[PDB]
Amino acid sequence: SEKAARFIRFCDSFNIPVLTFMDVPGYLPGVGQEHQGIIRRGIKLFYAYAESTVPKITVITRKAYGGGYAVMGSRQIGADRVMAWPTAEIAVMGANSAVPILLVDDYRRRFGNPYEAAAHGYVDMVISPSRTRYEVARALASLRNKRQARPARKHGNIPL
Amino acid sequence: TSTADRIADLAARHEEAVVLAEKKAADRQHLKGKLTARARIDLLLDPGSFVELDEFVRHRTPRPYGDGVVTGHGTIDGRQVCVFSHDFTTLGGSMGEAFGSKVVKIYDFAMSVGCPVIGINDSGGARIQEGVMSIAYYTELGVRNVHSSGVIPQISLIMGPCAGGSVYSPALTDFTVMVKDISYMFVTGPEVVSAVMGEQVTAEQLGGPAVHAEVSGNAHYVGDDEQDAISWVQTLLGYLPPNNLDPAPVYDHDCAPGITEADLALDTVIPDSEQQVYDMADVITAVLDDGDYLEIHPDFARNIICALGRVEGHSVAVVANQPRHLAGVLDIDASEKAARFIRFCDSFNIPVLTFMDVPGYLPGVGQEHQGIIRRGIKLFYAYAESTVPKITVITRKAYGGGYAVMGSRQIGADRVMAWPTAEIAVMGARRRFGNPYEAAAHGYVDMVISPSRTRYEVARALASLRNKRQARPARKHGNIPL
Amino acid sequence: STADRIADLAARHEEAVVLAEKKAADRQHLKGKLTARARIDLLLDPGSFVELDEFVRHRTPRPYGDGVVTGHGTIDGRQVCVFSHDFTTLGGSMGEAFGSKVVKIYDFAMSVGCPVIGINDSGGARIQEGVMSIAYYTELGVRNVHSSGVIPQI
Ligand SMILES: CCCCCC(=O)SCCNC(=O)CCNC(=O)[C@H](O)C(C)(C)COP(=O)(O)OP(=O)(O)OC[C@H]1O[C@@H](n2cnc3c(N)ncnc32)[C@H](O)[C@@H]1OP(=O)(O)O
């Protein structure tokens, strides 16, 4: 998170578009990461994406769960174009952790695909992987004149 | 049908939304020793000031009113604030689309008029039943935290088990306040940790108030009970402006125009012996009105102090090295605790008052491999970027990089005064260098004063600097190390 | 000893502010002139003067303050910045320490937006310091120019 966060804020400061290739199970839980502050330090990546105003294209190759999906250049966090491969899995959780809240599991493959997210317009395209380059290139071309306003402030108060 | 029928029908829906639902939720949260969402709002807000919004919102597809959250605005000590409060009894407090809509609306209002947002959390995070949609709304909320950052004060009360987005949004707000025994914070709960990683940990070991108040740093304060937490938040708001444009409150004061006994005591507070320590709070209290201050992160990085007080009725931010813990050295934790504090205060135009007694940085493999260079430099960045008035009082040790960082003149402090016990040098030990007079010769300190004049000089410096204005770099934002 | 260190500060304070004022009055009254401090007390409201860089010294006699009294105070309740040359000490000549002290209070006045009164009484440039004395004259001039029409200058 800290590696990618400062990378993104840097690129946003010098107007380099950010292209995200996403396949994320989520944030890493467990006592090691909590006592070291994963809650506020992993969220630095969220701040970085939402703060940025450069064009942002996202390709979802496979896993897209929970906070990982939110942070990794989702549409709601400010991505201009979100395209998904058919192998994309967009859900709040994996089926192994969501269903011990009722093998009524592979009916949780309601979510094992991108088509619910596509139904709500949370992804813009469901493409064959071979068209990725094509679709990235034109998306980047379409976004070069993007302009976005920024909050009126001395500076924000990013978690430290 | 009739007009009277429709008005009686509205009264009936309102009894079900506010009375019946509340009694049901009180019964189920009694199982856990907790108050209800509405009870918490009534403890927080001025009596009779609460205006509830979206009372009759329901999920689309049992569809209770509110979908598990109570939103609205009110006043705290006469000034307007916006509030939302999770209902853990409805689906574990998880956010669905109706839930998220209510929160998104209340945040949009607070951004629109520029008042603080108090979020009262008691939630499992994102509602699994709604899939992508719940994640979408929590992201909208987090985006609004980010666009609010440094624009309106944001305060989170953690008052139950909290996971996922229910800890992610608080982390983006300015202050997180937990409550003893009843609250927790983790990415995901202990049973998911067991099924996935799989470690066998108790909730208190994984993310209890003590873990976050003393180890991770995620909690700025832990209240003994809910009302203690809520009372802390009310006191905190009493120091802060509503937004980053309008001024902080000014209270009247009983400060003494001459020199008192408490001022004279500062002349004897520093021990004669260098390996004897003292309590920096004994210095802090002699300067601040009524000797009072609200301390941020009191149980975390106790080798530095961060507090808000008042000088002549004006809000003042205090950063001070505490010699009673780890000799008052700087480590990673003290650096990041004071760094974020200073940046918050600079965002909201609170002047920073620094008491320096710093022998240097904590040495060791633990510090160096855990990133003391890029994490400790955050305090340097915080000071150098700030434009608020900065006054620094140097009481004793002031060596090397520690001297540089703690609000020296060169890093941008507007006023630096030194006590005769101050030792400003590259390193210690020949004690013709054990004083502030080489620094005073170069002008690096502006004044060498008897300690008892501290309160008098600080008060006059702050007043001299109320109209300070300083230009900022032309940029979208900086690139502070993370 | 802490009490010793405070006592020592009291001693140096009196060689910088009190005794130097006696010697400076003795030599300037001979010429029908007041001293830098007495002029500051005539200018500012009683008890409002806050003196800065009292113990500044030049680098290479190294008197405290290097020949200029600087600080801020009030005139009829409103804030002003002030500097006052001490013609007795080192001729009131422009050195690097001297110029630093005046630059500091000019930066302060530009920072907080208050007028600056400068009381001039000077034999010119400290020649031993060479081009540095020029460098600091120029620095002050530039601050006069960036202040021009922004804060009043007397
Ligand atoms: C600011 C940045 C925002 C970013 C946005 C994001 O990325 S959001 C990240 C995405 N993922 C998350 O937020 C999920 C994190 N939450 C979790 O992992 C889990 O919910 C948990 C750790 C709280 C486990 O809670 P438990 O159910 O074991 O606790 P408990 O048994 O007391 O809960 C009682 C009731 O609440 C239900 N419940 C609890 N959490 C729920 C949830 N998240 N969604 C739906 N239902 C939930 C349970 O079904 C149960 O219902 P019944 O009593 O009726 O049986």
Residue numbers in the entry:
A (entry chain D): 354 to 455, 475 to 532
B (entry chain A): 15 to 75, 81 to 448, 480 to 532
C (entry chain C): 16 to 75, 81 to 174
Authors' text:
X-ray crystal structures of SamR0483 alone and in complex with hexanoyl-CoA reveal the molecular basis for medium chain acyl-CoA recognition by this unusual YCC β-subunit, prompting us to rename it medium chain acyl-CoA carboxylase beta subunit (MccB). Similar to other bacterial YCC β-subunits, MccB has 3–2 symmetry and is composed of three individual dimers that form a ring-like hexamer. Each monomer can be divided into two domains harbouring two copies of the crotonase fold that pack together in an antiparallel manner to form a dimer. Taken together, these results establish the existence of a unique YCC-dependent pathway for unusual polyketide extender unit biosynthesis.
To address this question structures of MccB bound to either one or four molecules of hexanoyl-CoA were solved to 2.75 and 2.85 Å, respectively. These co-crystal structures were obtained via incubation of MccB with 5 or 10 mM hexanoyl-CoA before crystallization. Interestingly, the electron density corresponding to residues 452–477 of monomer F was only present in the crystal form bound to four molecules of hexanoyl-CoA, suggesting that the helix-loop-helix lid region of MccB is stabilized at higher substrate concentrations. The first region is located at the entrance of the substrate binding pocket, which is characterized by a network of hydrogen bonds between the adenosine moiety of hexanoyl-CoA and the protein. The adenosine moiety is further stabilized by a hydrogen bond from the backbone carbonyl group of Pro453 to the 2' hydroxyl group of ribose. In the PccB co-crystal structure, propionyl-CoA binds close to the entrance of the active site, leaving the 3' phosphate of CoA more exposed to the solvent. Further, the adenine ring of hexanoyl-CoA is tilted ∼90° with respect to that of the adenine-ring of propionyl-CoA in the PccB co-crystal structure. Superimposition of the substrate bound MccB and PccB structures strongly suggested that replacing Gly161 with Phe in MccB would cause a steric clash with the aliphatic chain of hexanoyl-CoA.
